Structure formats: C-alpha cells, structure tokens
C-alpha cells in the first residue's frame, strides 16, 4: 500500500493529506495552496488544465471549463436533480450510457465527452501529484471521502474515478464523520451527539451522528446543495457591480472576463475578511481601460450577507426535529468548510446552540482530509 493518501474530493474544492512523522501532514500544490478548486478547463494548444490554474485561466468561453462534477457523480442523466442542476451550469452535459456526460471543446475544434466520473479522476489526479511531489514517491492508495448522503452509485462512481487515476479508493468515508475523527471525538467514552455544519463553497450540508464505541452512526442529513460562499461572493458582486454603474454608468456585466477578474478578487477580499476588518479590491484594465479601486469592511460583507447566513439555522433545526433531539442534547458541535472560517458563521452557530463552543483548531476547509490522513495513517502502518 505505500503511504496512503486522505483526499476530500470537493464539489468546489479539494484537499490532500498525509500521516508523516507522528502527526497528519496537509499537502500545498503546485501553486502552493493547502486547498485545489474542483476545476478543469483547456487551453488554446489544446492542453489540459486542472486545479488553480485551470479557475484561474481568464476565458471568454465558461461552456469549455468543468466543475461542480460532483453534483453529477454516480447519478443517471434522467435524475431529476441532474436535469434541475444542468439549468445553472454553463457547460454541455448529454445523455450517454444512461449518464451525464460532459461535452466540451478543448481547442482546435476538439469535442470530447467526459464522464462525471473521468473529470472527478482528473481532480483526483492532480491530488496524487500534489501529494506524490511533497512525499517524492508514487501513492498508490488513498481513503476518500464523500457527503454523508451518497448512495450505492455514488460511492461506487467515486472509487471509479479514483480507478481511472490510478488510486485504489480502500475506504470510502463520510465527510462529517472524518470531520468529526479530525477532532478525534471518535476516541470518547459513552454515546455522543455530534452536529456536524459544513458550509462550503456551492453547498450546506448539516449531519446528525452519534458516536459509540468508536462506531459513527449518521442519524439525519440535511442542508441546502445551493447555498455557500459562492453566494456570499455574489452577494459581493452585485454590490460592487451596481457601484461601478452608479460611479461610470457602465455595466460590466457585457464584459465576461471584467467579472472573472472581480469574482477572483472579491473571493480574495473574502477570505482576507475573515481575519481582519477591511479589504482592497483592485483591478487594473477591468472594465474599458479603466481601472478598479474599492475597498470592502467586514460590516458591509456581513451586512450584504446577513439574510443568508440567518438561513443556514434553518436546516439544523431540522434535523434535531427529524432525530428528536432538542438543542441541549447536542454533546459535539464541528464546523466544516471554508466559509465556516468566517466570524459571523461562527458567531450565529454558537449563539443557536446558546453559547456553546465548536470543536477548535483544524482549519475547517481541512479538517475533512485530516480525517481522511488520519485512516491512511492506519492503513499505511
Ligand atoms: N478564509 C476564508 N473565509 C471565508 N470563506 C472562505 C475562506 N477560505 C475558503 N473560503 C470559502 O470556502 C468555500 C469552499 O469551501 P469548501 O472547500 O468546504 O467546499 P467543498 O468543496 O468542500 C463543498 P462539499 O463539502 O459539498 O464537497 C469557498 O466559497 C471559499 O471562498
Ligand atoms: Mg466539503
């Protein structure tokens, strides 16, 4: 088995760890980032690019990138949630071998059509080699983990994107559950409830688990699969948006690579926002020439966002009714994700569970993988 990797395959973005020396090792690639977008797109030459660089590559072409394969993983083509989900994304999904496969050009007038599963070992890949360049040796092996709410196809069609990438999947986990053996919570005496929040990039996901001798039990999932930071960055967009119209009395929203550039740098200030209280957002040639200067406070971000960070309470109370548990019953509370970085998510989960602390100290966007290292650790010996 080698040394056996943790990887979270991320709808919006992935993550790759290690046990080395005593202690889980989080993996930065190639770009030197601790966290990869889900992201593959294509280059004129016709070259595959895949992580960082791939979001990153400015395009007037958004039906030539892929993402959020996840959403599509393990499903048939006639799933009603596929059908519902192809509406809001920009590239072609088709109908072939009963599945949604994604069709693309990649340059020279080349179609290609991709399984959700053959873009989710793209991922994959580039997660073995960022993982195999910090180790300089080949990884054969991996744990991976999946949403608590995956089924039979689900988990299969990730094993076999872990196949088509060389990687022998010997375990598939659940998300919250590795969470949760980040905070080793598994190592505890008697039966526990464990709410675990995982606000991420596209999606909400709460899950209710109780723990027992080392045994997790996923009692109720819930959430909301379009709810995330991507909407708070939006949020942000309009704004600043609707402020360069009012300032210049231009939309520029008729320039595509004008709102790449801004998503890129309000998604930045974001981040940034989560440790101090004010942002740059500057953008030289963003719209005709003319250059961009403004700056966001925390307030303002919290302010724009408030009505849906309110809105993720909502879920959790649902899942207490659905497990007939009531707040006080909660023994464990883990925030997973990266927007559970911000504090004011971190604020209005505690004040929910009437002042009661989180789990702390594994950044949340990791803590899935650290789970997943944790395991490999045992596995690898
Ligand atoms: N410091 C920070 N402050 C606020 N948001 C941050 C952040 N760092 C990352 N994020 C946000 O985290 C989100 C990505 O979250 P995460 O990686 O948990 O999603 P994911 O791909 O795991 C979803 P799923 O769990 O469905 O697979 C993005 O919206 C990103 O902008
Ligand atoms: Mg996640």
Same mark, same amino acid.
């Given at each position: 088995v080698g040394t056996v990797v943790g990887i979270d395959l991320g709808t919006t973005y992935s993550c790759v760890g290690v046990f080395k020396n005593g202690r889980v090792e989080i993996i930065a690639n190639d770009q030197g980032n601790r966290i990869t977008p889900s992201y593959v797109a294509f280059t004129p030459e016709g070259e595959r690019l895949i992580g960082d660089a791939a979001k990153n590559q400015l395009t007037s &072409?958004?039906? &030539?990138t892929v993402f959020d394969a996840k959403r599509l993983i *393990? @499903?048939?083509? &006639?799933?009603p949630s596929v059908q519902q989900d192809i509406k809001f994304l920009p590239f072609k999904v088709v109908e072939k071998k009963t599945k949604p496969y994604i069709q693309v050009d990649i340059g020279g007038g080349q179609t290609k059509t991709f399984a959700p599963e053959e873009i989710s070992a793209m991922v994959l890949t580039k997660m073995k080699e960022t993982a195999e360049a910090y180790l300089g040796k080949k990884v054969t092996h991996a744990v991976v983990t999946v949403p608590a709410y995956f089924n039979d196809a689900q988990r299969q069609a990730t094993k076999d994107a872990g196949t088509i990438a060389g990687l022998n999947v010997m375990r598939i986990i659940n998300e919250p559950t590795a969470a949760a053996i980040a905070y080793g919570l !598994?190592? @505890?005496?008697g039966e526990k409830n464990i709410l675990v929040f995982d606000l991420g990039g596209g999606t909400f996901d709460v899950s209710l688990l109780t723990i027992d001798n080392g045994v997790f039990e996923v009692v109720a999932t819930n959430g !909301? $699969?379009?709810?995330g930071g991507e909407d708070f960055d939006q949020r942000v967009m309009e704004h600043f948006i609707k402020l360069y119209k009012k300032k210049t009395g231009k939309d520029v929203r008729k320039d595509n690579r004008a709102v790449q550039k801004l998503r890129r740098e309000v998604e930045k200030a974001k981040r940034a926002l989560s440790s101090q209280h004010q942002a740059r957002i500057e953008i030289e040639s963003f719209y005709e020439g003319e250059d961009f200067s403004e700056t966001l406070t925390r307030a303002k971000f919290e302010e724009l966002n408030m009505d849906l960070f309110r809105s993720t309470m909502k879920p959790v109370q649902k899942v207490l009714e659905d497990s007939d548990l009531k707040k006080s019953d909660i023994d464990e509370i883990v925030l997973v994700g *990266?927007? $559970?970085?911000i504090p004011k998510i971190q604020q209005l989960v505690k004040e929910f569970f009437n002042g009661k602390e989180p789990s702390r100290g594994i950044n949340p966007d990791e803590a899935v993988a650290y789970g997943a290292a944790v395991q490999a650790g045992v596995l690898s010996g």
């Open positions: &072409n958004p039906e &030539n *393990g @499903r048939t083509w &006639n799933d !598994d190592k @505890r005496e !909301d $699969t379009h709810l *990266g927007s $559970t970085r």
